[PDB]
Amino acid sequence: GPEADFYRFQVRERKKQEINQLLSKFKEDQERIKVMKAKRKFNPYT
């Protein structure tokens, strides 16, 4: 619609603050987690 279209563009086109730091944190966790996992995320033997 014409309304949802405006709020949509204005929403994203605006900027990102909260989601910024949030995503950064998640990424950091993915970094450490990956290091902890070392190898692939699979079970060679179970």
Side-chain angles (χ1 to χ4, degrees):
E3 313 275 28
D5 269 317
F6 256 52
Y7 246 60
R8 262 261 258 281
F9 293 127
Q10 83 92 252
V11 147
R12 272 293 144 80
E13 196 230 57
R14 254 295 297 186
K15 49 102 135 129
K16 45 113 187 74
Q17 181 192 340
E18 279 67 73
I19 59 174
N20 202 110
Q21 254 196 33
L22 179 74
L23 262 57
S24 80
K25 205 72 254 167
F26 235 122
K27 261 144 221 222
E28 269 110 70
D29 309 319
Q30 256 308 274
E31 269 145 279
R32 60 206 206 80
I33 293 275
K34 277 238 227 266
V35 184
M36 307 279 86
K37 251 97 174 157
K39 267 197 144 271
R40 221 249 186 196
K41 295 98 88 98
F42 199 46
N43 259 52
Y45 203 90
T46 324

Tab-separated table of all heavy atoms in Angstrom:
chain	number	residue	atom	x	y	z
A	1	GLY	N	0.828	-1.238	0.000
A	1	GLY	CA	0.000	0.000	0.000
A	1	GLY	C	0.843	1.262	0.000
A	1	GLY	O	2.060	1.197	0.165
A	2	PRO	N	0.216	2.437	-0.185
A	2	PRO	CA	0.929	3.718	-0.203
A	2	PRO	C	1.452	4.110	1.175
A	2	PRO	O	2.478	4.780	1.294
A	2	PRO	CB	-0.135	4.711	-0.672
A	2	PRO	CG	-1.431	4.094	-0.274
A	2	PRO	CD	-1.235	2.608	-0.389
A	3	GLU	N	0.739	3.688	2.214
A	3	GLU	CA	1.131	3.994	3.585
A	3	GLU	C	2.299	3.122	4.026
A	3	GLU	O	3.342	3.624	4.446
A	3	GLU	CB	-0.054	3.794	4.531
A	3	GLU	CG	-1.341	4.430	4.036
A	3	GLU	CD	-1.449	5.897	4.407
A	3	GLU	OE1	-0.394	6.550	4.556
A	3	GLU	OE2	-2.587	6.391	4.550
A	4	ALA	N	2.112	1.815	3.923
A	4	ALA	CA	3.145	0.860	4.307
A	4	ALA	C	4.432	1.101	3.526
A	4	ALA	O	5.528	0.853	4.025
A	4	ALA	CB	2.655	-0.564	4.092
A	5	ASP	N	4.290	1.593	2.300
A	5	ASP	CA	5.442	1.872	1.453
A	5	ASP	C	6.263	3.024	2.020
A	5	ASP	O	7.494	2.983	2.023
A	5	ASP	CB	4.989	2.206	0.030
A	5	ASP	CG	4.927	0.980	-0.859
A	5	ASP	OD1	5.858	0.150	-0.794
A	5	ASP	OD2	3.944	0.846	-1.621
A	6	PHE	N	5.572	4.052	2.503
A	6	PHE	CA	6.235	5.216	3.078
A	6	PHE	C	6.966	4.841	4.365
A	6	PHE	O	8.159	5.102	4.510
A	6	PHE	CB	5.216	6.323	3.357
A	6	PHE	CG	5.254	7.441	2.356
A	6	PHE	CD1	5.182	7.175	0.998
A	6	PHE	CD2	5.361	8.758	2.772
A	6	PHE	CE1	5.215	8.201	0.074
A	6	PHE	CE2	5.397	9.788	1.853
A	6	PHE	CZ	5.324	9.510	0.502
A	7	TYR	N	6.239	4.230	5.294
A	7	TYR	CA	6.818	3.818	6.569
A	7	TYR	C	7.955	2.824	6.354
A	7	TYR	O	8.907	2.776	7.133
A	7	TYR	CB	5.740	3.200	7.463
A	7	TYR	CG	5.438	4.014	8.700
A	7	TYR	CD1	4.969	5.318	8.600
A	7	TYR	CD2	5.621	3.480	9.970
A	7	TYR	CE1	4.693	6.066	9.729
A	7	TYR	CE2	5.346	4.220	11.104
A	7	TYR	CZ	4.881	5.513	10.977
A	7	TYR	OH	4.607	6.255	12.103
A	8	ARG	N	7.850	2.031	5.293
A	8	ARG	CA	8.871	1.038	4.980
A	8	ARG	C	10.183	1.712	4.591
A	8	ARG	O	11.212	1.512	5.239
A	8	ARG	CB	8.394	0.129	3.843
A	8	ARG	CG	7.817	-1.194	4.324
A	8	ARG	CD	8.839	-2.315	4.233
A	8	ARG	NE	8.615	-3.166	3.066
A	8	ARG	CZ	7.693	-4.125	3.014
A	8	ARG	NH1	6.907	-4.356	4.057
A	8	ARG	NH2	7.556	-4.853	1.915
A	9	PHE	N	10.138	2.512	3.533
A	9	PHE	CA	11.321	3.219	3.056
A	9	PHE	C	11.896	4.118	4.146
A	9	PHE	O	13.091	4.077	4.431
A	9	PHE	CB	10.979	4.053	1.820
A	9	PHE	CG	10.616	3.225	0.619
A	9	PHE	CD1	9.436	3.457	-0.066
A	9	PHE	CD2	11.458	2.217	0.177
A	9	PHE	CE1	9.100	2.699	-1.172
A	9	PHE	CE2	11.128	1.454	-0.928
A	9	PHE	CZ	9.946	1.695	-1.603
A	10	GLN	N	11.036	4.931	4.751
A	10	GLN	CA	11.459	5.841	5.809
A	10	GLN	C	12.091	5.080	6.972
A	10	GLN	O	13.024	5.564	7.611
A	10	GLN	CB	10.268	6.677	6.297
A	10	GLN	CG	9.389	5.971	7.320
A	10	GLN	CD	9.809	6.261	8.748
A	10	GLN	OE1	10.362	5.400	9.433
A	10	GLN	NE2	9.547	7.480	9.206
A	11	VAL	N	11.574	3.885	7.239
A	11	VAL	CA	12.085	3.056	8.323
A	11	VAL	C	13.530	2.642	8.063
A	11	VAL	O	14.426	2.938	8.853
A	11	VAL	CB	11.203	1.796	8.519
A	11	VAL	CG1	12.024	0.600	8.984
A	11	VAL	CG2	10.078	2.087	9.501
A	12	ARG	N	13.740	1.946	6.956
A	12	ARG	CA	15.071	1.474	6.586
A	12	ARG	C	15.965	2.623	6.128
A	12	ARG	O	17.091	2.770	6.601
A	12	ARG	CB	14.962	0.423	5.482
A	12	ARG	CG	14.774	-0.991	6.005
A	12	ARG	CD	16.011	-1.482	6.739
A	12	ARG	NE	15.671	-2.317	7.889
A	12	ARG	CZ	15.329	-3.601	7.798
A	12	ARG	NH1	15.279	-4.199	6.615
A	12	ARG	NH2	15.038	-4.288	8.896
A	13	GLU	N	15.460	3.432	5.201
A	13	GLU	CA	16.219	4.565	4.677
A	13	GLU	C	16.707	5.475	5.802
A	13	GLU	O	17.713	6.169	5.656
A	13	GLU	CB	15.365	5.367	3.693
A	13	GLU	CG	16.173	6.309	2.815
A	13	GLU	CD	15.621	7.721	2.810
A	13	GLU	OE1	15.509	8.319	3.901
A	13	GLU	OE2	15.297	8.229	1.716
A	14	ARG	N	15.989	5.469	6.921
A	14	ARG	CA	16.356	6.297	8.066
A	14	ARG	C	17.776	5.986	8.535
A	14	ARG	O	18.719	6.704	8.203
A	14	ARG	CB	15.362	6.088	9.213
A	14	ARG	CG	14.402	7.250	9.405
A	14	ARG	CD	15.134	8.514	9.830
A	14	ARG	NE	15.792	8.355	11.125
A	14	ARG	CZ	16.400	9.346	11.773
A	14	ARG	NH1	16.436	10.566	11.251
A	14	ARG	NH2	16.974	9.116	12.946
A	15	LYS	N	17.922	4.911	9.305
A	15	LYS	CA	19.229	4.508	9.818
A	15	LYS	C	19.107	3.288	10.724
A	15	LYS	O	18.017	2.743	10.905
A	15	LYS	CB	19.881	5.660	10.584
A	15	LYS	CG	18.955	6.308	11.598
A	15	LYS	CD	19.270	5.853	13.015
A	15	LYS	CE	19.286	7.023	13.988
A	15	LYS	NZ	18.437	6.762	15.182
A	16	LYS	N	20.231	2.865	11.293
A	16	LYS	CA	20.250	1.710	12.184
A	16	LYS	C	21.164	1.961	13.379
A	16	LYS	O	22.366	2.178	13.219
A	16	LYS	CB	20.712	0.463	11.428
A	16	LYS	CG	21.930	0.705	10.550
A	16	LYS	CD	23.148	-0.046	11.062
A	16	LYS	CE	24.401	0.328	10.285
A	16	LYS	NZ	24.893	1.685	10.647
A	17	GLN	N	20.587	1.933	14.577
A	17	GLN	CA	21.350	2.159	15.799
A	17	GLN	C	21.283	0.943	16.716
A	17	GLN	O	22.293	0.280	16.959
A	17	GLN	CB	20.824	3.396	16.531
A	17	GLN	CG	21.585	3.718	17.805
A	17	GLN	CD	20.880	4.753	18.661
A	17	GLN	OE1	20.038	5.507	18.175
A	17	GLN	NE2	21.221	4.793	19.944
A	18	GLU	N	20.090	0.656	17.225
A	18	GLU	CA	19.892	-0.480	18.119
A	18	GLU	C	20.307	-1.782	17.442
A	18	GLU	O	21.091	-2.556	17.991
A	18	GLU	CB	18.428	-0.562	18.557
A	18	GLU	CG	18.082	0.379	19.699
A	18	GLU	CD	18.167	1.838	19.298
A	18	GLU	OE1	17.280	2.301	18.549
A	18	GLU	OE2	19.121	2.519	19.730
A	19	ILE	N	19.775	-2.018	16.248
A	19	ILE	CA	20.091	-3.226	15.497
A	19	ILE	C	21.583	-3.311	15.191
A	19	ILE	O	22.130	-4.400	15.018
A	19	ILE	CB	19.302	-3.289	14.174
A	19	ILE	CG1	19.613	-2.066	13.311
A	19	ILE	CG2	17.810	-3.385	14.451
A	19	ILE	CD1	18.990	-2.127	11.933
A	20	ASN	N	22.237	-2.155	15.123
A	20	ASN	CA	23.666	-2.102	14.838
A	20	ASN	C	24.465	-2.823	15.919
A	20	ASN	O	25.114	-3.837	15.654
A	20	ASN	CB	24.132	-0.648	14.728
A	20	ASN	CG	25.422	-0.512	13.944
A	20	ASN	OD1	25.430	0.001	12.826
A	20	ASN	ND2	26.522	-0.973	14.528
A	21	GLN	N	24.413	-2.296	17.138
A	21	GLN	CA	25.131	-2.890	18.259
A	21	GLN	C	24.668	-4.323	18.504
A	21	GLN	O	25.465	-5.192	18.859
A	21	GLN	CB	24.931	-2.050	19.523
A	21	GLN	CG	26.158	-1.240	19.912
A	21	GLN	CD	26.095	-0.738	21.340
A	21	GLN	OE1	25.541	-1.398	22.219
A	21	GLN	NE2	26.667	0.437	21.582
A	22	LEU	N	23.376	-4.564	18.310
A	22	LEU	CA	22.807	-5.891	18.508
A	22	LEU	C	23.479	-6.910	17.592
A	22	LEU	O	23.965	-7.944	18.047
A	22	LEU	CB	21.300	-5.868	18.247
A	22	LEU	CG	20.595	-7.217	18.399
A	22	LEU	CD1	20.468	-7.591	19.868
A	22	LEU	CD2	19.227	-7.179	17.736
A	23	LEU	N	23.501	-6.608	16.298
A	23	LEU	CA	24.113	-7.495	15.317
A	23	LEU	C	25.597	-7.694	15.620
A	23	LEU	O	26.127	-8.795	15.477
A	23	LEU	CB	23.936	-6.931	13.904
A	23	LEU	CG	22.763	-7.518	13.117
A	23	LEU	CD1	21.461	-7.333	13.881
A	23	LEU	CD2	22.672	-6.877	11.740
A	24	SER	N	26.257	-6.621	16.043
A	24	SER	CA	27.677	-6.679	16.370
A	24	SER	C	27.929	-7.676	17.494
A	24	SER	O	28.894	-8.440	17.458
A	24	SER	CB	28.188	-5.295	16.774
A	24	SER	OG	27.847	-4.997	18.117
A	25	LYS	N	27.049	-7.666	18.487
A	25	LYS	CA	27.166	-8.570	19.622
A	25	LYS	C	26.998	-10.015	19.173
A	25	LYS	O	27.793	-10.887	19.524
A	25	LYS	CB	26.118	-8.228	20.681
A	25	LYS	CG	26.508	-8.657	22.087
A	25	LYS	CD	27.620	-7.783	22.648
A	25	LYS	CE	28.951	-8.515	22.664
A	25	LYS	NZ	30.092	-7.589	22.905
A	26	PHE	N	25.957	-10.256	18.385
A	26	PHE	CA	25.678	-11.592	17.872
A	26	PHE	C	26.865	-12.120	17.076
A	26	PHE	O	27.228	-13.292	17.183
A	26	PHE	CB	24.422	-11.573	16.998
A	26	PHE	CG	23.377	-12.563	17.426
A	26	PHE	CD1	22.102	-12.141	17.762
A	26	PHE	CD2	23.671	-13.916	17.489
A	26	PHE	CE1	21.137	-13.049	18.156
A	26	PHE	CE2	22.712	-14.829	17.884
A	26	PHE	CZ	21.443	-14.395	18.217
A	27	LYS	N	27.470	-11.242	16.284
A	27	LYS	CA	28.623	-11.614	15.474
A	27	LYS	C	29.784	-12.033	16.365
A	27	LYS	O	30.444	-13.040	16.112
A	27	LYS	CB	29.042	-10.448	14.577
A	27	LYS	CG	28.527	-10.565	13.151
A	27	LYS	CD	28.149	-9.207	12.580
A	27	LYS	CE	26.866	-9.281	11.766
A	27	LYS	NZ	26.964	-8.493	10.506
A	28	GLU	N	30.019	-11.258	17.416
A	28	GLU	CA	31.094	-11.551	18.356
A	28	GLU	C	30.908	-12.940	18.953
A	28	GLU	O	31.863	-13.707	19.085
A	28	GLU	CB	31.132	-10.502	19.468
A	28	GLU	CG	32.046	-9.326	19.164
A	28	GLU	CD	31.282	-8.043	18.903
A	28	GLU	OE1	30.692	-7.497	19.860
A	28	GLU	OE2	31.271	-7.584	17.742
A	29	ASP	N	29.667	-13.259	19.300
A	29	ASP	CA	29.346	-14.559	19.871
A	29	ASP	C	29.601	-15.660	18.853
A	29	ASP	O	30.061	-16.746	19.202
A	29	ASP	CB	27.891	-14.599	20.333
A	29	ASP	CG	27.533	-13.429	21.227
A	29	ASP	OD1	28.362	-13.064	22.088
A	29	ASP	OD2	26.425	-12.876	21.067
A	30	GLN	N	29.310	-15.372	17.592
A	30	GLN	CA	29.524	-16.336	16.527
A	30	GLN	C	31.016	-16.574	16.321
A	30	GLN	O	31.437	-17.657	15.913
A	30	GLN	CB	28.883	-15.850	15.231
A	30	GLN	CG	27.584	-16.563	14.902
A	30	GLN	CD	27.720	-18.074	14.929
A	30	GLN	OE1	28.108	-18.692	13.937
A	30	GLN	NE2	27.400	-18.676	16.069
A	31	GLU	N	31.810	-15.548	16.616
A	31	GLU	CA	33.253	-15.628	16.471
A	31	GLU	C	33.852	-16.547	17.528
A	31	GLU	O	34.592	-17.479	17.209
A	31	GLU	CB	33.874	-14.234	16.575
A	31	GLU	CG	34.024	-13.531	15.236
A	31	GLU	CD	33.810	-12.033	15.339
A	31	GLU	OE1	32.638	-11.600	15.357
A	31	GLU	OE2	34.815	-11.294	15.400
A	32	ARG	N	33.523	-16.285	18.789
A	32	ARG	CA	34.030	-17.100	19.881
A	32	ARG	C	33.509	-18.520	19.755
A	32	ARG	O	34.266	-19.480	19.857
A	32	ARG	CB	33.627	-16.507	21.232
A	32	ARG	CG	32.127	-16.409	21.422
A	32	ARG	CD	31.755	-15.300	22.392
A	32	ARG	NE	30.475	-15.554	23.049
A	32	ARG	CZ	30.323	-16.378	24.084
A	32	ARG	NH1	31.367	-17.026	24.583
A	32	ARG	NH2	29.123	-16.554	24.620
A	33	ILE	N	32.211	-18.641	19.516
A	33	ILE	CA	31.573	-19.942	19.356
A	33	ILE	C	32.293	-20.767	18.298
A	33	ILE	O	32.579	-21.948	18.502
A	33	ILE	CB	30.088	-19.785	18.967
A	33	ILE	CG1	29.299	-19.172	20.132
A	33	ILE	CG2	29.488	-21.124	18.544
A	33	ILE	CD1	28.826	-20.181	21.158
A	34	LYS	N	32.589	-20.136	17.170
A	34	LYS	CA	33.282	-20.808	16.083
A	34	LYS	C	34.647	-21.301	16.546
A	34	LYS	O	35.032	-22.438	16.273
A	34	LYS	CB	33.430	-19.865	14.891
A	34	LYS	CG	32.191	-19.816	14.012
A	34	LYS	CD	32.503	-20.206	12.575
A	34	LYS	CE	31.886	-19.231	11.585
A	34	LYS	NZ	30.551	-19.689	11.110
A	35	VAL	N	35.371	-20.444	17.261
A	35	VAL	CA	36.684	-20.808	17.777
A	35	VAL	C	36.579	-22.023	18.692
A	35	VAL	O	37.383	-22.952	18.608
A	35	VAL	CB	37.329	-19.644	18.556
A	35	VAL	CG1	38.732	-20.014	19.011
A	35	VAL	CG2	37.350	-18.379	17.709
A	36	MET	N	35.573	-22.008	19.559
A	36	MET	CA	35.339	-23.103	20.490
A	36	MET	C	35.057	-24.398	19.736
A	36	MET	O	35.491	-25.475	20.143
A	36	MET	CB	34.166	-22.772	21.418
A	36	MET	CG	34.305	-21.433	22.129
A	36	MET	SD	35.379	-21.522	23.573
A	36	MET	CE	36.979	-21.266	22.809
A	37	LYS	N	34.324	-24.282	18.633
A	37	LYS	CA	33.982	-25.436	17.818
A	37	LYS	C	35.199	-25.932	17.042
A	37	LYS	O	35.336	-27.128	16.780
A	37	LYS	CB	32.847	-25.088	16.851
A	37	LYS	CG	31.526	-25.753	17.201
A	37	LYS	CD	30.627	-24.821	17.998
A	37	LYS	CE	29.251	-25.428	18.215
A	37	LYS	NZ	28.565	-24.842	19.399
A	38	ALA	N	36.080	-25.004	16.680
A	38	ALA	CA	37.289	-25.337	15.938
A	38	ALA	C	36.958	-25.961	14.585
A	38	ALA	O	37.006	-25.290	13.555
A	38	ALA	CB	38.165	-26.267	16.763
A	39	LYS	N	36.622	-27.247	14.594
A	39	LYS	CA	36.283	-27.958	13.368
A	39	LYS	C	34.839	-27.680	12.960
A	39	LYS	O	34.155	-26.864	13.576
A	39	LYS	CB	36.498	-29.461	13.551
A	39	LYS	CG	37.872	-29.937	13.107
A	39	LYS	CD	37.904	-31.444	12.915
A	39	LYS	CE	38.790	-31.838	11.743
A	39	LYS	NZ	38.034	-31.872	10.461
A	40	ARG	N	34.381	-28.366	11.917
A	40	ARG	CA	33.017	-28.195	11.424
A	40	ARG	C	32.001	-28.399	12.544
A	40	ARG	O	32.336	-28.901	13.616
A	40	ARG	CB	32.738	-29.174	10.282
A	40	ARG	CG	31.941	-28.566	9.140
A	40	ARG	CD	30.538	-29.147	9.065
A	40	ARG	NE	29.815	-28.680	7.884
A	40	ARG	CZ	28.497	-28.781	7.734
A	40	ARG	NH1	27.754	-29.329	8.686
A	40	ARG	NH2	27.919	-28.330	6.628
A	41	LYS	N	30.757	-28.005	12.287
A	41	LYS	CA	29.693	-28.144	13.273
A	41	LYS	C	28.960	-29.471	13.096
A	41	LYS	O	27.732	-29.508	13.009
A	41	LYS	CB	28.707	-26.979	13.157
A	41	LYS	CG	29.319	-25.629	13.493
A	41	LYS	CD	29.738	-24.880	12.238
A	41	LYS	CE	28.597	-24.046	11.678
A	41	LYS	NZ	28.692	-22.620	12.095
A	42	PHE	N	29.721	-30.559	13.044
A	42	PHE	CA	29.146	-31.888	12.879
A	42	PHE	C	29.752	-32.872	13.875
A	42	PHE	O	30.789	-32.598	14.480
A	42	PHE	CB	29.368	-32.387	11.450
A	42	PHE	CG	28.442	-33.501	11.052
A	42	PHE	CD1	27.085	-33.422	11.321
A	42	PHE	CD2	28.929	-34.628	10.409
A	42	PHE	CE1	26.230	-34.445	10.954
A	42	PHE	CE2	28.080	-35.654	10.041
A	42	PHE	CZ	26.729	-35.563	10.315
A	43	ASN	N	29.098	-34.016	14.040
A	43	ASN	CA	29.572	-35.042	14.963
A	43	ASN	C	30.182	-36.219	14.203
A	43	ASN	O	29.461	-37.042	13.640
A	43	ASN	CB	28.422	-35.531	15.846
A	43	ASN	CG	28.455	-34.913	17.230
A	43	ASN	OD1	28.525	-33.693	17.378
A	43	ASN	ND2	28.404	-35.756	18.256
A	44	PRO	N	31.523	-36.318	14.175
A	44	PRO	CA	32.220	-37.406	13.478
A	44	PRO	C	31.824	-38.776	14.015
A	44	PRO	O	31.856	-39.772	13.291
A	44	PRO	CB	33.703	-37.132	13.759
A	44	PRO	CG	33.765	-35.690	14.128
A	44	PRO	CD	32.467	-35.387	14.818
A	45	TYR	N	31.450	-38.819	15.288
A	45	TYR	CA	31.045	-40.067	15.926
A	45	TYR	C	30.077	-39.801	17.074
A	45	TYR	O	30.303	-38.915	17.897
A	45	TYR	CB	32.272	-40.822	16.442
A	45	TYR	CG	32.042	-42.307	16.608
A	45	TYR	CD1	32.303	-43.190	15.568
A	45	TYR	CD2	31.563	-42.826	17.805
A	45	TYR	CE1	32.094	-44.549	15.716
A	45	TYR	CE2	31.353	-44.182	17.960
A	45	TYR	CZ	31.619	-45.039	16.913
A	45	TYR	OH	31.411	-46.391	17.064
A	46	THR	N	28.997	-40.575	17.121
A	46	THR	CA	27.994	-40.422	18.168
A	46	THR	C	27.499	-41.782	18.651
A	46	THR	O	26.712	-42.418	17.918
A	46	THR	CB	26.817	-39.589	17.660
A	46	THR	OG1	27.265	-38.572	16.781
A	46	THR	CG2	26.031	-38.924	18.768
